[PDB]
Amino acid sequence: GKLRQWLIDQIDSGKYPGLVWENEEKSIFRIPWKHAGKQDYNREEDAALFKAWALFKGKFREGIDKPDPPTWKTRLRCALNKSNDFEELVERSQLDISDPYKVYRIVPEGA
Amino acid sequence: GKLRQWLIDQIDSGKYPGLVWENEEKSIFRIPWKHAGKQDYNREEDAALFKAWALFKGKFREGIDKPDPPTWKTRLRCALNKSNDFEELVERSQLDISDPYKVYRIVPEGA
DNA sequence: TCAACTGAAACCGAGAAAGC
DNA sequence: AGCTTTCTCGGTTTCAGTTG
């Protein structure tokens, strides 16, 4: 399973604005989640994390495949949904604000 | 897939005035479609089918959610649009009359 | 004026399928 | 094999834009 450490690395990297830890224990984080239809939407910035997952897993090849941010978003979402390593704290997510984000908890390796 | 048999059941039920079959083969039907801004509009009657779909899918809970007929209508419209089981006969729909309705064909499961 | 309405497209959870 | 990520499906939600 690559998702757990890859995502932890992405947050720890500080390369994705808004992809940040919410506590110092590094067990809860925010992941920017902007709807791709908004005017506010900028693919280069708002799709960067989804694309990186597609690039990292080889499901998209720069220069060869047509860019498809909607598909990229679905892949990371479904991976998070089915992952036993991550749990959305849905009551804490902020999808209705100008810079929307979902909140995820990282499950301890024992549960 | 729940919409096809659910809607057939609603028509067959006869509980929704104006929600009726257009032939005896039960392959074409009418769905009352009154604009919610009209004075003629009665929520309890004109939104009953839309509400029933929202209740059936758990998208509206009495005691939890505020009544919102426009959302109920949008939900059923978009589902009909996207479903391969139903096709609007737009030339037969009557949106310009005092009791407006849309006409739908039910596509055979073989197509 | 603005609530309701719209097609199109983006989005969604879940189970099957695919992949390690 | 058993685990993790992806594909498929049947709707749902949101978008800019229109309508009554």
Side-chain angles (χ1 to χ4, degrees), chain B residues 2-33:
Chain B
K2 287 166 164 195
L3 177 63
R4 187 193 171 100
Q5 189 56 54
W6 179 90
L7 190 43
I8 291 175
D9 289 356
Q10 298 331 293
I11 305 157
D12 274 331
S13 81
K15 298 162 35 184
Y16 305 93
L19 184 71
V20 300
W21 297 111
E22 205 149 283
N23 55 11
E24 290 170 15
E25 15 290 312
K26 301 196 172 169
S27 64
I28 299 171
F29 66 95
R30 286 177 190 193
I31 170 177
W33 206 268

PDB file of all heavy atoms in Angstrom, chain B residues 2-33:
ATOM      1  N   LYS B   2     -32.428   1.818  -8.997  1.00  0.00           N
ATOM      2  CA  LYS B   2     -33.751   1.895  -8.398  1.00  0.00           C
ATOM      3  C   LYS B   2     -34.771   2.739  -9.174  1.00  0.00           C
ATOM      4  O   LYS B   2     -35.971   2.494  -9.019  1.00  0.00           O
ATOM      5  CB  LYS B   2     -33.652   2.436  -6.966  1.00  0.00           C
ATOM      6  CG  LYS B   2     -33.083   1.489  -5.965  1.00  0.00           C
ATOM      7  CD  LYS B   2     -32.726   2.256  -4.679  1.00  0.00           C
ATOM      8  CE  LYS B   2     -32.494   1.342  -3.465  1.00  0.00           C
ATOM      9  NZ  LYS B   2     -32.520   2.128  -2.169  1.00  0.00           N
ATOM     10  N   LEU B   3     -34.351   3.708 -10.008  1.00  0.00           N
ATOM     11  CA  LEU B   3     -35.308   4.696 -10.521  1.00  0.00           C
ATOM     12  C   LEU B   3     -36.375   4.063 -11.408  1.00  0.00           C
ATOM     13  O   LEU B   3     -37.554   4.442 -11.336  1.00  0.00           O
ATOM     14  CB  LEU B   3     -34.596   5.808 -11.290  1.00  0.00           C
ATOM     15  CG  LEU B   3     -35.493   6.878 -11.940  1.00  0.00           C
ATOM     16  CD1 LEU B   3     -36.275   7.653 -10.890  1.00  0.00           C
ATOM     17  CD2 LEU B   3     -34.674   7.829 -12.758  1.00  0.00           C
ATOM     18  N   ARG B   4     -35.988   3.121 -12.270  1.00  0.00           N
ATOM     19  CA  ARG B   4     -36.925   2.616 -13.270  1.00  0.00           C
ATOM     20  C   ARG B   4     -38.164   2.020 -12.608  1.00  0.00           C
ATOM     21  O   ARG B   4     -39.292   2.493 -12.820  1.00  0.00           O
ATOM     22  CB  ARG B   4     -36.237   1.602 -14.180  1.00  0.00           C
ATOM     23  CG  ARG B   4     -37.093   1.155 -15.353  1.00  0.00           C
ATOM     24  CD  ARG B   4     -36.483  -0.066 -16.016  1.00  0.00           C
ATOM     25  NE  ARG B   4     -37.358  -0.667 -17.018  1.00  0.00           N
ATOM     26  CZ  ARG B   4     -37.223  -0.471 -18.323  1.00  0.00           C
ATOM     27  NH1 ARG B   4     -36.253   0.324 -18.772  1.00  0.00           N
ATOM     28  NH2 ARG B   4     -38.057  -1.062 -19.178  1.00  0.00           N
ATOM     29  N   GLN B   5     -37.965   0.987 -11.781  1.00  0.00           N
ATOM     30  CA  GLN B   5     -39.094   0.329 -11.134  1.00  0.00           C
ATOM     31  C   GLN B   5     -39.774   1.242 -10.124  1.00  0.00           C
ATOM     32  O   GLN B   5     -40.989   1.146  -9.932  1.00  0.00           O
ATOM     33  CB  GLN B   5     -38.642  -0.965 -10.457  1.00  0.00           C
ATOM     34  CG  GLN B   5     -39.781  -1.813  -9.946  1.00  0.00           C
ATOM     35  CD  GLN B   5     -40.785  -2.173 -11.045  1.00  0.00           C
ATOM     36  OE1 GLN B   5     -40.424  -2.722 -12.094  1.00  0.00           O
ATOM     37  NE2 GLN B   5     -42.062  -1.873 -10.796  1.00  0.00           N
ATOM     38  N   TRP B   6     -39.018   2.116  -9.458  1.00  0.00           N
ATOM     39  CA  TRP B   6     -39.646   3.042  -8.517  1.00  0.00           C
ATOM     40  C   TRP B   6     -40.665   3.922  -9.237  1.00  0.00           C
ATOM     41  O   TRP B   6     -41.814   4.051  -8.804  1.00  0.00           O
ATOM     42  CB  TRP B   6     -38.590   3.896  -7.800  1.00  0.00           C
ATOM     43  CG  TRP B   6     -39.194   4.906  -6.812  1.00  0.00           C
ATOM     44  CD1 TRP B   6     -39.453   4.703  -5.474  1.00  0.00           C
ATOM     45  CD2 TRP B   6     -39.645   6.241  -7.100  1.00  0.00           C
ATOM     46  NE1 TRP B   6     -40.014   5.831  -4.917  1.00  0.00           N
ATOM     47  CE2 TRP B   6     -40.148   6.787  -5.894  1.00  0.00           C
ATOM     48  CE3 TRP B   6     -39.654   7.035  -8.252  1.00  0.00           C
ATOM     49  CZ2 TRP B   6     -40.651   8.096  -5.813  1.00  0.00           C
ATOM     50  CZ3 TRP B   6     -40.167   8.332  -8.167  1.00  0.00           C
ATOM     51  CH2 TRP B   6     -40.655   8.843  -6.957  1.00  0.00           C
ATOM     52  N   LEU B   7     -40.268   4.502 -10.366  1.00  0.00           N
ATOM     53  CA  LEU B   7     -41.150   5.414 -11.085  1.00  0.00           C
ATOM     54  C   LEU B   7     -42.337   4.673 -11.684  1.00  0.00           C
ATOM     55  O   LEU B   7     -43.481   5.157 -11.625  1.00  0.00           O
ATOM     56  CB  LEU B   7     -40.352   6.168 -12.154  1.00  0.00           C
ATOM     57  CG  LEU B   7     -41.047   7.343 -12.860  1.00  0.00           C
ATOM     58  CD1 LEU B   7     -41.830   8.232 -11.873  1.00  0.00           C
ATOM     59  CD2 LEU B   7     -39.994   8.156 -13.590  1.00  0.00           C
ATOM     60  N   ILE B   8     -42.087   3.494 -12.264  1.00  0.00           N
ATOM     61  CA  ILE B   8     -43.183   2.662 -12.756  1.00  0.00           C
ATOM     62  C   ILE B   8     -44.184   2.411 -11.634  1.00  0.00           C
ATOM     63  O   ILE B   8     -45.394   2.595 -11.801  1.00  0.00           O
ATOM     64  CB  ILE B   8     -42.636   1.343 -13.339  1.00  0.00           C
ATOM     65  CG1 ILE B   8     -41.864   1.604 -14.641  1.00  0.00           C
ATOM     66  CG2 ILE B   8     -43.767   0.317 -13.545  1.00  0.00           C
ATOM     67  CD1 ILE B   8     -41.178   0.373 -15.218  1.00  0.00           C
ATOM     68  N   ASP B   9     -43.679   2.051 -10.451  1.00  0.00           N
ATOM     69  CA  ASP B   9     -44.546   1.840  -9.287  1.00  0.00           C
ATOM     70  C   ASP B   9     -45.363   3.086  -8.950  1.00  0.00           C
ATOM     71  O   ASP B   9     -46.540   2.981  -8.598  1.00  0.00           O
ATOM     72  CB  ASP B   9     -43.711   1.436  -8.072  1.00  0.00           C
ATOM     73  CG  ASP B   9     -43.144   0.042  -8.190  1.00  0.00           C
ATOM     74  OD1 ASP B   9     -43.470  -0.639  -9.184  1.00  0.00           O
ATOM     75  OD2 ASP B   9     -42.379  -0.370  -7.282  1.00  0.00           O
ATOM     76  N   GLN B  10     -44.737   4.267  -8.998  1.00  0.00           N
ATOM     77  CA  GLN B  10     -45.438   5.503  -8.659  1.00  0.00           C
ATOM     78  C   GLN B  10     -46.582   5.759  -9.628  1.00  0.00           C
ATOM     79  O   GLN B  10     -47.692   6.093  -9.210  1.00  0.00           O
ATOM     80  CB  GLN B  10     -44.476   6.695  -8.645  1.00  0.00           C
ATOM     81  CG  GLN B  10     -43.332   6.629  -7.615  1.00  0.00           C
ATOM     82  CD  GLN B  10     -43.691   5.830  -6.364  1.00  0.00           C
ATOM     83  OE1 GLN B  10     -44.542   6.243  -5.577  1.00  0.00           O
ATOM     84  NE2 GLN B  10     -43.035   4.674  -6.179  1.00  0.00           N
ATOM     85  N   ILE B  11     -46.328   5.592 -10.926  1.00  0.00           N
ATOM     86  CA  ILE B  11     -47.382   5.769 -11.922  1.00  0.00           C
ATOM     87  C   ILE B  11     -48.504   4.776 -11.685  1.00  0.00           C
ATOM     88  O   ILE B  11     -49.680   5.149 -11.591  1.00  0.00           O
ATOM     89  CB  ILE B  11     -46.820   5.619 -13.348  1.00  0.00           C
ATOM     90  CG1 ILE B  11     -45.655   6.582 -13.570  1.00  0.00           C
ATOM     91  CG2 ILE B  11     -47.938   5.845 -14.370  1.00  0.00           C
ATOM     92  CD1 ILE B  11     -44.708   6.158 -14.683  1.00  0.00           C
ATOM     93  N   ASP B  12     -48.145   3.490 -11.587  1.00  0.00           N
ATOM     94  CA  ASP B  12     -49.120   2.430 -11.369  1.00  0.00           C
ATOM     95  C   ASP B  12     -49.922   2.651 -10.100  1.00  0.00           C
ATOM     96  O   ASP B  12     -51.082   2.237 -10.020  1.00  0.00           O
ATOM     97  CB  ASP B  12     -48.394   1.094 -11.309  1.00  0.00           C
ATOM     98  CG  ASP B  12     -48.196   0.497 -12.669  1.00  0.00           C
ATOM     99  OD1 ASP B  12     -49.050   0.789 -13.553  1.00  0.00           O
ATOM    100  OD2 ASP B  12     -47.195  -0.241 -12.860  1.00  0.00           O
ATOM    101  N   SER B  13     -49.328   3.319  -9.111  1.00  0.00           N
ATOM    102  CA  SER B  13     -49.983   3.497  -7.820  1.00  0.00           C
ATOM    103  C   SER B  13     -51.230   4.354  -7.940  1.00  0.00           C
ATOM    104  O   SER B  13     -52.184   4.166  -7.179  1.00  0.00           O
ATOM    105  CB  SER B  13     -48.998   4.107  -6.823  1.00  0.00           C
ATOM    106  OG  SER B  13     -48.924   5.502  -7.032  1.00  0.00           O
ATOM    107  N   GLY B  14     -51.243   5.295  -8.881  1.00  0.00           N
ATOM    108  CA  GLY B  14     -52.355   6.216  -9.035  1.00  0.00           C
ATOM    109  C   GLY B  14     -52.496   7.238  -7.932  1.00  0.00           C
ATOM    110  O   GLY B  14     -53.487   7.971  -7.911  1.00  0.00           O
ATOM    111  N   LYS B  15     -51.505   7.355  -7.051  1.00  0.00           N
ATOM    112  CA  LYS B  15     -51.558   8.289  -5.937  1.00  0.00           C
ATOM    113  C   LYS B  15     -51.244   9.717  -6.355  1.00  0.00           C
ATOM    114  O   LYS B  15     -51.475  10.644  -5.569  1.00  0.00           O
ATOM    115  CB  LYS B  15     -50.588   7.838  -4.838  1.00  0.00           C
ATOM    116  CG  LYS B  15     -50.933   6.483  -4.255  1.00  0.00           C
ATOM    117  CD  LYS B  15     -49.763   5.831  -3.503  1.00  0.00           C
ATOM    118  CE  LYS B  15     -48.872   6.828  -2.758  1.00  0.00           C
ATOM    119  NZ  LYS B  15     -47.707   6.123  -2.123  1.00  0.00           N
ATOM    120  N   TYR B  16     -50.704   9.910  -7.555  1.00  0.00           N
ATOM    121  CA  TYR B  16     -50.245  11.215  -8.010  1.00  0.00           C
ATOM    122  C   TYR B  16     -51.120  11.670  -9.164  1.00  0.00           C
ATOM    123  O   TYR B  16     -50.958  11.184 -10.297  1.00  0.00           O
ATOM    124  CB  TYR B  16     -48.782  11.138  -8.441  1.00  0.00           C
ATOM    125  CG  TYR B  16     -47.855  10.591  -7.372  1.00  0.00           C
ATOM    126  CD1 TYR B  16     -47.556   9.237  -7.327  1.00  0.00           C
ATOM    127  CD2 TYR B  16     -47.279  11.424  -6.415  1.00  0.00           C
ATOM    128  CE1 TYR B  16     -46.702   8.717  -6.361  1.00  0.00           C
ATOM    129  CE2 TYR B  16     -46.426  10.913  -5.438  1.00  0.00           C
ATOM    130  CZ  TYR B  16     -46.140   9.551  -5.425  1.00  0.00           C
ATOM    131  OH  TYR B  16     -45.302   8.997  -4.471  1.00  0.00           O
ATOM    132  N   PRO B  17     -52.073  12.571  -8.937  1.00  0.00           N
ATOM    133  CA  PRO B  17     -52.915  13.038 -10.048  1.00  0.00           C
ATOM    134  C   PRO B  17     -52.045  13.605 -11.159  1.00  0.00           C
ATOM    135  O   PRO B  17     -51.023  14.254 -10.908  1.00  0.00           O
ATOM    136  CB  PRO B  17     -53.815  14.105  -9.407  1.00  0.00           C
ATOM    137  CG  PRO B  17     -53.187  14.404  -8.056  1.00  0.00           C
ATOM    138  CD  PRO B  17     -52.432  13.179  -7.646  1.00  0.00           C
ATOM    139  N   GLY B  18     -52.386  13.247 -12.394  1.00  0.00           N
ATOM    140  CA  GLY B  18     -51.624  13.689 -13.532  1.00  0.00           C
ATOM    141  C   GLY B  18     -50.428  12.828 -13.864  1.00  0.00           C
ATOM    142  O   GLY B  18     -49.903  12.927 -14.976  1.00  0.00           O
ATOM    143  N   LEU B  19     -49.952  12.023 -12.919  1.00  0.00           N
ATOM    144  CA  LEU B  19     -48.892  11.055 -13.186  1.00  0.00           C
ATOM    145  C   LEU B  19     -49.569   9.821 -13.749  1.00  0.00           C
ATOM    146  O   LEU B  19     -50.085   8.995 -13.004  1.00  0.00           O
ATOM    147  CB  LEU B  19     -48.132  10.709 -11.912  1.00  0.00           C
ATOM    148  CG  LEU B  19     -46.959   9.773 -12.177  1.00  0.00           C
ATOM    149  CD1 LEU B  19     -45.889  10.536 -12.910  1.00  0.00           C
ATOM    150  CD2 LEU B  19     -46.434   9.171 -10.890  1.00  0.00           C
ATOM    151  N   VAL B  20     -49.629   9.700 -15.068  1.00  0.00           N
ATOM    152  CA  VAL B  20     -50.496   8.701 -15.680  1.00  0.00           C
ATOM    153  C   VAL B  20     -49.812   8.118 -16.909  1.00  0.00           C
ATOM    154  O   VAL B  20     -48.972   8.766 -17.547  1.00  0.00           O
ATOM    155  CB  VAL B  20     -51.887   9.285 -16.062  1.00  0.00           C
ATOM    156  CG1 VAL B  20     -52.630   9.819 -14.831  1.00  0.00           C
ATOM    157  CG2 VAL B  20     -51.769  10.363 -17.119  1.00  0.00           C
ATOM    158  N   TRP B  21     -50.197   6.883 -17.238  1.00  0.00           N
ATOM    159  CA  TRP B  21     -49.776   6.253 -18.479  1.00  0.00           C
ATOM    160  C   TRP B  21     -50.464   6.891 -19.680  1.00  0.00           C
ATOM    161  O   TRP B  21     -51.626   7.305 -19.625  1.00  0.00           O
ATOM    162  CB  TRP B  21     -50.100   4.764 -18.466  1.00  0.00           C
ATOM    163  CG  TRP B  21     -49.379   4.013 -17.416  1.00  0.00           C
ATOM    164  CD1 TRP B  21     -49.913   3.431 -16.296  1.00  0.00           C
ATOM    165  CD2 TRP B  21     -47.970   3.754 -17.377  1.00  0.00           C
ATOM    166  NE1 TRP B  21     -48.916   2.817 -15.571  1.00  0.00           N
ATOM    167  CE2 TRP B  21     -47.717   2.999 -16.216  1.00  0.00           C
ATOM    168  CE3 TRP B  21     -46.898   4.087 -18.217  1.00  0.00           C
ATOM    169  CZ2 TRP B  21     -46.436   2.574 -15.867  1.00  0.00           C
ATOM    170  CZ3 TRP B  21     -45.624   3.658 -17.874  1.00  0.00           C
ATOM    171  CH2 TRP B  21     -45.405   2.906 -16.708  1.00  0.00           C
ATOM    172  N   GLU B  22     -49.737   6.945 -20.785  1.00  0.00           N
ATOM    173  CA  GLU B  22     -50.283   7.457 -22.023  1.00  0.00           C
ATOM    174  C   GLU B  22     -50.713   6.334 -22.968  1.00  0.00           C
ATOM    175  O   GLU B  22     -51.406   6.592 -23.958  1.00  0.00           O
ATOM    176  CB  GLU B  22     -49.263   8.406 -22.676  1.00  0.00           C
ATOM    177  CG  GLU B  22     -49.907   9.423 -23.583  1.00  0.00           C
ATOM    178  CD  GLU B  22     -49.185  10.766 -23.657  1.00  0.00           C
ATOM    179  OE1 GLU B  22     -49.303  11.582 -22.721  1.00  0.00           O
ATOM    180  OE2 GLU B  22     -48.512  11.012 -24.681  1.00  0.00           O
ATOM    181  N   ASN B  23     -50.333   5.091 -22.689  1.00  0.00           N
ATOM    182  CA  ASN B  23     -50.818   3.962 -23.478  1.00  0.00           C
ATOM    183  C   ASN B  23     -51.047   2.759 -22.569  1.00  0.00           C
ATOM    184  O   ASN B  23     -50.602   2.724 -21.421  1.00  0.00           O
ATOM    185  CB  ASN B  23     -49.854   3.621 -24.621  1.00  0.00           C
ATOM    186  CG  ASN B  23     -48.446   3.359 -24.140  1.00  0.00           C
ATOM    187  OD1 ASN B  23     -48.192   3.226 -22.942  1.00  0.00           O
ATOM    188  ND2 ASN B  23     -47.516   3.287 -25.075  1.00  0.00           N
ATOM    189  N   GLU B  24     -51.715   1.743 -23.110  1.00  0.00           N
ATOM    190  CA  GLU B  24     -51.977   0.556 -22.312  1.00  0.00           C
ATOM    191  C   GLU B  24     -50.761  -0.350 -22.178  1.00  0.00           C
ATOM    192  O   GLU B  24     -50.687  -1.114 -21.209  1.00  0.00           O
ATOM    193  CB  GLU B  24     -53.120  -0.271 -22.912  1.00  0.00           C
ATOM    194  CG  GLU B  24     -54.497   0.350 -22.813  1.00  0.00           C
ATOM    195  CD  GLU B  24     -55.507  -0.403 -23.641  1.00  0.00           C
ATOM    196  OE1 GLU B  24     -55.207  -1.541 -24.053  1.00  0.00           O
ATOM    197  OE2 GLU B  24     -56.611   0.122 -23.872  1.00  0.00           O
ATOM    198  N   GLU B  25     -49.790  -0.248 -23.088  1.00  0.00           N
ATOM    199  CA  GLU B  25     -48.547  -0.998 -22.955  1.00  0.00           C
ATOM    200  C   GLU B  25     -47.680  -0.459 -21.830  1.00  0.00           C
ATOM    201  O   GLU B  25     -46.672  -1.085 -21.495  1.00  0.00           O
ATOM    202  CB  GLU B  25     -47.757  -1.000 -24.273  1.00  0.00           C
ATOM    203  CG  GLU B  25     -48.187   0.034 -25.328  1.00  0.00           C
ATOM    204  CD  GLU B  25     -49.562  -0.257 -25.962  1.00  0.00           C
ATOM    205  OE1 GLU B  25     -49.806  -1.418 -26.383  1.00  0.00           O
ATOM    206  OE2 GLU B  25     -50.405   0.678 -26.024  1.00  0.00           O
ATOM    207  N   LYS B  26     -48.053   0.679 -21.247  1.00  0.00           N
ATOM    208  CA  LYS B  26     -47.317   1.280 -20.139  1.00  0.00           C
ATOM    209  C   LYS B  26     -45.866   1.563 -20.543  1.00  0.00           C
ATOM    210  O   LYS B  26     -44.919   1.287 -19.811  1.00  0.00           O
ATOM    211  CB  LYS B  26     -47.396   0.381 -18.900  1.00  0.00           C
ATOM    212  CG  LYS B  26     -48.824   0.112 -18.403  1.00  0.00           C
ATOM    213  CD  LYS B  26     -48.824  -0.445 -16.987  1.00  0.00           C
ATOM    214  CE  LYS B  26     -50.236  -0.536 -16.413  1.00  0.00           C
ATOM    215  NZ  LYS B  26     -50.256  -1.323 -15.127  1.00  0.00           N
ATOM    216  N   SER B  27     -45.692   2.136 -21.727  1.00  0.00           N
ATOM    217  CA  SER B  27     -44.365   2.488 -22.210  1.00  0.00           C
ATOM    218  C   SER B  27     -44.153   3.990 -22.352  1.00  0.00           C
ATOM    219  O   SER B  27     -43.010   4.417 -22.542  1.00  0.00           O
ATOM    220  CB  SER B  27     -44.092   1.802 -23.558  1.00  0.00           C
ATOM    221  OG  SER B  27     -44.985   2.274 -24.557  1.00  0.00           O
ATOM    222  N   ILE B  28     -45.214   4.789 -22.280  1.00  0.00           N
ATOM    223  CA  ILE B  28     -45.142   6.246 -22.344  1.00  0.00           C
ATOM    224  C   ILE B  28     -46.018   6.799 -21.229  1.00  0.00           C
ATOM    225  O   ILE B  28     -47.123   6.293 -20.998  1.00  0.00           O
ATOM    226  CB  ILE B  28     -45.613   6.785 -23.705  1.00  0.00           C
ATOM    227  CG1 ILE B  28     -44.732   6.268 -24.833  1.00  0.00           C
ATOM    228  CG2 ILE B  28     -45.601   8.302 -23.713  1.00  0.00           C
ATOM    229  CD1 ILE B  28     -45.307   6.606 -26.203  1.00  0.00           C
ATOM    230  N   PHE B  29     -45.533   7.831 -20.536  1.00  0.00           N
ATOM    231  CA  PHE B  29     -46.284   8.389 -19.420  1.00  0.00           C
ATOM    232  C   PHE B  29     -46.080   9.897 -19.327  1.00  0.00           C
ATOM    233  O   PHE B  29     -45.205  10.487 -19.976  1.00  0.00           O
ATOM    234  CB  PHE B  29     -45.914   7.713 -18.091  1.00  0.00           C
ATOM    235  CG  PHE B  29     -44.494   7.950 -17.638  1.00  0.00           C
ATOM    236  CD1 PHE B  29     -44.199   8.972 -16.759  1.00  0.00           C
ATOM    237  CD2 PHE B  29     -43.466   7.127 -18.051  1.00  0.00           C
ATOM    238  CE1 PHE B  29     -42.890   9.174 -16.302  1.00  0.00           C
ATOM    239  CE2 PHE B  29     -42.170   7.335 -17.608  1.00  0.00           C
ATOM    240  CZ  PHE B  29     -41.886   8.375 -16.729  1.00  0.00           C
ATOM    241  N   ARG B  30     -46.911  10.515 -18.493  1.00  0.00           N
ATOM    242  CA  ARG B  30     -46.895  11.951 -18.264  1.00  0.00           C
ATOM    243  C   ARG B  30     -46.410  12.237 -16.855  1.00  0.00           C
ATOM    244  O   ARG B  30     -46.767  11.521 -15.913  1.00  0.00           O
ATOM    245  CB  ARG B  30     -48.283  12.542 -18.397  1.00  0.00           C
ATOM    246  CG  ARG B  30     -48.784  12.656 -19.782  1.00  0.00           C
ATOM    247  CD  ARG B  30     -50.189  13.192 -19.725  1.00  0.00           C
ATOM    248  NE  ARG B  30     -50.842  13.121 -21.016  1.00  0.00           N
ATOM    249  CZ  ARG B  30     -51.972  13.757 -21.282  1.00  0.00           C
ATOM    250  NH1 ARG B  30     -52.528  14.502 -20.338  1.00  0.00           N
ATOM    251  NH2 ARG B  30     -52.527  13.650 -22.477  1.00  0.00           N
ATOM    252  N   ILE B  31     -45.636  13.302 -16.695  1.00  0.00           N
ATOM    253  CA  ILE B  31     -45.231  13.651 -15.345  1.00  0.00           C
ATOM    254  C   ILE B  31     -45.533  15.126 -15.101  1.00  0.00           C
ATOM    255  O   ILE B  31     -44.968  16.000 -15.776  1.00  0.00           O
ATOM    256  CB  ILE B  31     -43.762  13.261 -15.109  1.00  0.00           C
ATOM    257  CG1 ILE B  31     -43.233  13.830 -13.816  1.00  0.00           C
ATOM    258  CG2 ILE B  31     -42.894  13.688 -16.269  1.00  0.00           C
ATOM    259  CD1 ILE B  31     -41.791  13.363 -13.577  1.00  0.00           C
ATOM    260  N   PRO B  32     -46.445  15.437 -14.175  1.00  0.00           N
ATOM    261  CA  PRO B  32     -46.847  16.840 -13.960  1.00  0.00           C
ATOM    262  C   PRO B  32     -45.638  17.680 -13.607  1.00  0.00           C
ATOM    263  O   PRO B  32     -44.781  17.262 -12.830  1.00  0.00           O
ATOM    264  CB  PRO B  32     -47.819  16.756 -12.783  1.00  0.00           C
ATOM    265  CG  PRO B  32     -48.347  15.382 -12.821  1.00  0.00           C
ATOM    266  CD  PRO B  32     -47.213  14.502 -13.334  1.00  0.00           C
ATOM    267  N   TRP B  33     -45.554  18.867 -14.196  1.00  0.00           N
ATOM    268  CA  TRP B  33     -44.323  19.632 -14.128  1.00  0.00           C
ATOM    269  C   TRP B  33     -44.606  21.122 -13.987  1.00  0.00           C
ATOM    270  O   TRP B  33     -44.178  21.928 -14.799  1.00  0.00           O
ATOM    271  CB  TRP B  33     -43.494  19.363 -15.382  1.00  0.00           C
ATOM    272  CG  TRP B  33     -42.034  19.559 -15.185  1.00  0.00           C
ATOM    273  CD1 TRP B  33     -41.323  20.693 -15.406  1.00  0.00           C
ATOM    274  CD2 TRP B  33     -41.103  18.584 -14.720  1.00  0.00           C
ATOM    275  NE1 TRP B  33     -40.009  20.492 -15.110  1.00  0.00           N
ATOM    276  CE2 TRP B  33     -39.842  19.202 -14.683  1.00  0.00           C
ATOM    277  CE3 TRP B  33     -41.215  17.245 -14.336  1.00  0.00           C
ATOM    278  CZ2 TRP B  33     -38.693  18.534 -14.267  1.00  0.00           C
ATOM    279  CZ3 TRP B  33     -40.082  16.578 -13.935  1.00  0.00           C
ATOM    280  CH2 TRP B  33     -38.834  17.220 -13.896  1.00  0.00           C
TER     281      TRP B  33
END
